[PDB]
Ligand binder design. Structure first.
Ligand SMILES: OC[C@H]1O[C@H](O[C@H]2O[C@H](CO)[C@@H](O)[C@H](O)[C@H]2O)[C@H](O)[C@@H](O)[C@@H]1O
Ligand SMILES: OC[C@H]1O[C@H](O[C@H]2O[C@H](CO)[C@@H](O)[C@H](O)[C@H]2O)[C@H](O)[C@@H](O)[C@@H]1O
Ligand SMILES: OC[C@H]1O[C@H](O[C@H]2O[C@H](CO)[C@@H](O)[C@H](O)[C@H]2O)[C@H](O)[C@@H](O)[C@@H]1O
Ligand SMILES: OC[C@H]1O[C@H](O[C@H]2O[C@H](CO)[C@@H](O)[C@H](O)[C@H]2O)[C@H](O)[C@@H](O)[C@@H]1O
Ligand SMILES: OC[C@H]1O[C@H](O[C@H]2O[C@H](CO)[C@@H](O)[C@H](O)[C@H]2O)[C@H](O)[C@@H](O)[C@@H]1O
Ligand SMILES: OC[C@H]1O[C@H](O[C@H]2O[C@H](CO)[C@@H](O)[C@H](O)[C@H]2O)[C@H](O)[C@@H](O)[C@@H]1O
Ligand code: 16G
Ligand code: 16G
Ligand code: 16G
Ligand code: 16G
Ligand code: 16G
Ligand code: 16G
Ligand code: AGP
Ligand code: AGP
Ligand code: AGP
Ligand code: AGP
Ligand code: AGP
Ligand code: AGP
Lengths: 274, 281, 274, 274, 274, 274
């Protein structure tokens, strides 16, 4: 793995944004070669989305030839509901960039046949040529997307029932009432994300420190699904200092020593300008 | 994984039997489409076998188009010995159902060339089109079949030497005397079981609690081979309350919360019998 | 796995050499069927190499139809530098046997495009038909080759930065100065070694006991890369008594009970003399 | 230990209040025999205090002959600051009951000589004949009072610098700003609390589950100071369902099986009314 | 601690019996200086008791000036019931030796006031001048006496409710049926046994290997009460090979290396004969 | 505990020397009030001793009224042997300072009655009024003095047989011959050191990182005897960066945050000069 460590949230968000920017630009997508991006929702990636929007407005980055696939969506919640992930993505990112609406893909949590919706989502990813870069986060319980503890590490897109940690963490978005949070969600599987050519997990905050420790210091375990990426060929973990609190000093020293090498991934910072 | 938790052994046994019954009936096996079933032995699956027999006698389930593959058998033990797995399967299941003898497969622990017998077993599984549902259990050492601690997690069928825990736990079936238990056994590999389309592990009793904890709470480790299924796409763990004693409260709460959903797998319970004529609207 | 336990380093070294000898002879390589051998460097395998040379000098074993691929090499060290792995292999093994120079392959730590060199190495392995038997060791930090803690368990050949652990352990080869040990190395990946048809890890000494315990008693974890072999179909660990100090009594008892069965792998000891 | 498990926060709060009520009433304190009660602050004991007040207003319980000693107080915060523990105790408990002001003791965080203030606090506890019942809570990091991870398990009252977890958890009381939480606190030691004749730890919420697990399922460790009570002769843990999420099923079943016996501690519920 | 390792149950039993024999003889008890011996029940000590009896019958050992205190007894069971510990001791030991009935002490689980009975037991121990040597065992749950997981490590003699493990282990002694096993028992506390001048724990069988590991390889933890003796000045653990299966090789090698030194404790073997 | 972290060995050594210096000077020992100092041997404390000598030579520190008690000594090795601890202390420290020989105390590993010599050592410590400051180190196996893994945590001075780790580590002083390292040693117990008013453990180097982790991050365990100090009221751990490699980032950050506070223990630095 590549463990990138920044001092604060803003810095981690920025590093992740710069990386995505460089990857898209250097990939140089076009009409016959789109850049496929897997995406997360939540407050963690918001900073990254904000920076990406800035780069776009400044004329340094374009999403015209980018296709996106979100990792999940709540089941039974109206799409127009302000707390739906469809609403989150549109209001916080898509409506602010030059991406084609038809090239953004989010699971339909109100589909008549939920499993059919999930299977169709997998087929869309396949039809798009797979995912080039899948950006994700880690839950307090170590989950990737909604692959709660005890999820098959080779799972595909399917319906999952939210665990206690997830409900408690999202209660705020639903009047602080636990029972208000949707009981289930449609989510890409651990295997679905593992199929991406590259995976970048953004982790910020002391509240994620223990989960990060479980995911990269302890072994492959289906109780902490992000641990599955220990067997992925190209995963990058981008975090701030607080998220590293539970890791061994030796580990952080090793990767901080590698920041000179890894910062070259974002410096120089490329642009579509000229 | 799907972790199913029942109150007692009888209920856990019954749930497993109902699931197998529904899977077979809904699979609807025929001459050109057999249902392949991997099977275990021991006191644990006995309750399940008894229920399956009950279903057969009641005329609700047929094994005519089912092929079975047992996970293991002792090396050097007389096939007619009351403790051989051949005898266990014949007396506790096969002789009570309508499965065809040519469709039941058990490793021959008395073959002169043991590895050849093992390789031939894998060939039979392949010829049958793979395993649709593999039923297994877990040892006190966390083993699947006889893949003792330290076994490759991608192993195929081969000869294995029984470890201490297994010998001691099985010493009761041989005059309660240790050295009387066969030293080796022929066993499907962890990889062999992993290749099944679905795996169902039945676990009952407080004496299996620690092994279950190691297998599903701790990570993938060849010291507790059932842990390999954390990387299988479709595994079901059926246990009774006592088997969950070493698990975290949070884990049990989560899965108990899913029992209403998971009971849909055994309710309704299907039958091969003709549909009721008097059904309206 | 098969865990072979010998009394002393000498006996462990010898068992490994006998096994390699039997495997090559029984494989019976020829002009259209070479025996591909993956190899390590270091004091641990030195004893094995010395025995292999003895077998050759005695006329019992030939490397004429053997192709070798070394696990790694330091980046930046002159090829003929006395501490380079090129030099270690030439002076401690190759020049004393009948293997053809063109059939020995070692990563070029002096290449300009390091990743291109690594990719070429992988192509050479593929061209040779893969590795029949990969011999390796375990670092005090549990590494295989230079796949330091935190390396992808499905990694391929690439550049890796040495961890402090490895730097400390190899400083004795560079005038005892840490600052003089090469900072990076080219190394086959965990996945590269896993692709071998058979893997034999030689481990000796109390200083390797904790790492051995981590690799075989604890689970699959990218922090102790040799643990990856728990998912390899045919891995053999060869150790001496001191290397077993951190294992459970039960584990050692089990494998010592299998020594009669496993010694059949080296007895009879075959010879090309008939 | 006695582990008491209730369904919700309200029920756990009530059980603790009933126990304190029964202990004081049966102790039957008087002008020459006071009941010494060690007390905590925070949101956790809030429900308990509210019940105790209800009991008093109903004429069922009197604190007239009760002396209290709070486990800690922030250094530097003006005593009258709304966030001082002096303020917390006065507004949430003391001003609502019949306890004598001169019999309530809280460490003076504004003293010039901090250690002298701490030593004086210990003298006062001794002068009062020790603590009959010390009520406490557990921090997310397993602390008792402000005996942060790495505190001597036989420590006495002294100055302690708050750890990260404590700062983050208490920031909500200071406009959600971490930089506003006092850096140090005066706190009774682990040994101070261990000297109490009986110790009752109140634990509620899923956010305390891991700490409880560390304190009672893992061993005596100064990293999780509540673990020290494993060597106390009379400690009672009162929690709600959510606080038991990280414990083994076996542990919870054992203690739930003892609830019939343990409920005799609060049933019947005594009253001073005659 | 002193960890004594014998090959089989019979050998471990004999070593234990020889040690008790030498301790009594060299102590040379008299009417004004009795030898106080703490004792356990169960199948583990059976072999030891048999040897002690042989020693007595051969005229080599006398229990005339020995006082015994058993660690526990079931509550609600008829004193003369075949499964009572009163009966176990009389049948398996007392009736076969020259000890005086007035000098054998066992908790009366049928006392009107159980707690008073426990306190009285502690008084008797003190009146006898304390316990010179307390012999015990270890449960599958690591318990000493009936100090089940979660028992105070400084507990005194009291009533305890049997845990799952203990129930399942004794169910066979009551028609293999679980509910038939007495729900409670009177037991000396961990502190009670810790007060002995010397403690000898006898452990045999692979079914005790995990508990032994928890008790001496992991740290002080009230979940495995025998771990408390890590803080006792003079404890001896006597086991057979099978009981050591879960321990680290290094630990067993260290103590097997001390067997020649420790055998001096039982060789020469003394006798009261002139 | 107080964990002091310095950059390298030299800095850690100096901090320790400065602290011992300040403690002695401020203690102001005299004819009827000696400063009792417990001392260790080995390469770890060498740097500290060198600095203390400098302070003496510069006329800033006097050992005239200081009494010393060394923690251990080899059994059976001639006192005149260059590697005896008597020789180590006199050649590396005592002969270079103004301490009175009669006030230096080291166990006699060649005494006729070893236990008597040990008991006599405890009496001398008591006669001296106990130990004011006991300076020690930690073994790779976490030992304090020669209280090898599996030593009673309340042990007194006695004979101990060295464990494999100690043998392997000390072999460097006996030409690298393991079998040349003395088999046994007389050593103060864990309890003996715990009785000191203050304990300072010096830990330097990556080879000690795991033991430090075991001693302060895991719990009280007789397998890692320095862990016993978790229950000491005043222990100070002085280490360098490399010794902290196995600790959690959170722990190191907490203590580095306290370095300005703890440096007040050595700044200002006092002198006997008026
Ligand atoms: O990230 C920098 C590299 O970008 C290119 O590689 C990406 O885009 C190609 C499509 O245009 C893909 O074939 C390739 O898999 C992507 O990684 C550029 O082509 C490289 O030179 C840069 O190293
Ligand atoms: O278990 C319920 C499902 O049963 C069928 O699916 C099984 O049998 C088929 C063969 O007849 C296979 O193709 C399939 O893979 C099996 O799962 C039924 O056909 C489905 O509708 C049910 O969901
Ligand atoms: O190691 C003993 C075996 O050697 C042969 O098998 C090896 O060499 C063959 C090439 O000639 C390969 O096909 C095979 O994969 C190797 O394992 C021998 O042919 C066997 O009989 C022995 O078991
Ligand atoms: O909690 C119930 C018990 O209360 C009394 O015991 C307490 O109060 C006494 C002072 O009045 C103390 O001596 C004693 O230590 C306290 O526990 C009552 O006196 C007992 O009968 C009850 O068991
Ligand atoms: O175990 C051998 C030792 O036995 C004596 O010590 C025991 O008995 C004495 C009473 O007679 C006590 O003072 C003492 O505490 C016991 O240990 C004998 O007196 C010693 O010489 C032996 O070492
Ligand atoms: O370390 C600084 C302190 O030194 C004194 O305290 C030491 O010396 C006294 C006399 O010998 C002892 O009573 C005391 O226990 C030692 O700690 C000084 O007297 C203090 O003021 C300083 O804090
Ligand atoms: C409503 C619901 O929650 N359904 C899920 C299902 O989608 C999933 O396949 C299975 C196993 O979980 P897994 O696929 O992660 O192993 O659990 C549940 O039965
Ligand atoms: C008689 C016997 O016990 N033979 C087994 C062998 O069949 C197995 O392949 C190997 C490794 O175990 P593994 O295949 O599980 O990795 O161990 C033994 O040498
Ligand atoms: C100079 C250097 O050290 N480069 C390596 C790189 O080759 C490797 O791919 C990556 C992840 O490590 P991994 O491939 O083992 O997961 O880490 C570094 O950025
Ligand atoms: C400002 C401050 O934080 N001071 C504390 C001090 O009061 C405490 O005695 C010592 C050890 O912690 P401990 O007493 O818990 O072992 O740490 C700090 O140096
Ligand atoms: C009927 C019964 O089981 N009573 C026990 C009691 O005797 C014991 O003091 C307490 C704590 O256990 P502990 O003393 O070991 O800490 O638990 C129970 O409430
Ligand atoms: C020659 C020798 O090594 N003797 C020691 C002895 O002095 C020590 O008391 C005992 C227990 O170790 P402990 O005192 O640390 O518990 O072990 C040995 O039998
Ligand atoms: N399923 C996602 C959002 O619900 C999840 O992957 C996310 O990364 C995690 O729950 C953290 O959410 P945060 O962004 O709110 O921290
Ligand atoms: N060898 C296998 C038998 O199917 C294994 O799964 C077996 O179930 C295990 O040893 C447990 O035996 P039990 O079923 O008798 O508990
Ligand atoms: N470069 C070696 C790194 O020290 C590494 O290849 C090898 O895998 C292992 O460290 C063996 O070293 P040894 O031979 O010195 O034991
Ligand atoms: N020092 C106490 C309060 O500041 C602390 O022990 C408390 O128990 C813990 O921090 C939890 O606080 P809470 O009551 O707010 O949960
Ligand atoms: N209650 C004790 C017996 O009186 C119990 O300590 C005993 O040592 C333990 O349960 C082991 O029993 P066993 O000897 O029957 O294995
Ligand atoms: N024998 C003790 C000291 O004399 C032992 O505590 C010592 O601290 C430990 O062996 C460390 O030795 P080192 O200083 O050589 O690392």
């Amino acid at each position: 793995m590549k463990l990138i460590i920044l001092e604060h949230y803003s810095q981690a968000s920025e590093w992740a944004a710069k990386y995505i920017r460089n990857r898209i630009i250097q990939f140089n997508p076009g009409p016959e070669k789109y850049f496929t991006l897997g995406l997360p929702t939540g407050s963690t990636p918001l900073g990254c989305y904000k920076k990406l929007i800035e780069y776009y407005k400044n004329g340094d980055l374009s999403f015209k030839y980018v296709k996106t696939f979100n990792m999940d969506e709540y089941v039974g919640l109206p799409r127009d509901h302000p707390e739906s992930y469809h609403s989150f993505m549109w209001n916080n990112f898509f409506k602010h960039i030059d991406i084609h609406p038809e090239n953004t893909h989010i699971l339909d949590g109100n589909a008549v046949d939920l499993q059919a919706e999930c299977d169709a989502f997998e087929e869309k990813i396949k039809a798009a040529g797979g995912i080039e870069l899948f950006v994700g986060g880690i839950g307090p319980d170590g989950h990737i997307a909604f692959n709660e503890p005890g999820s098959s590490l080779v799972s595909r897109t399917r319906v999952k029932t939210l665990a206690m940690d997830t409900i408690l963490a999202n209660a705020r978005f639903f009047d602080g009432e636990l029972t208000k949070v949707p009981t289930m969600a449609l989510t890409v599987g651990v295997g679905t994300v593992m199929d991406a050519r590259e995976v970048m997990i953004l982790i910020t905050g002391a509240h994620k420190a223990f989960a990060l420790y479980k995911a990269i210091e302890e072994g492959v375990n289906h109780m902490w699904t992000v641990s599955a990426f220990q067997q992925h060929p190209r995963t990058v973990f981008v975090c701030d200092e607080d998220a590293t609190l539970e890791l061994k000093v030796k580990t952080v020293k090793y990767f901080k020593g590698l920041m000179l090498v890894h910062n070259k991934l974002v410096d120089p910072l490329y642009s579509i300008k000229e």
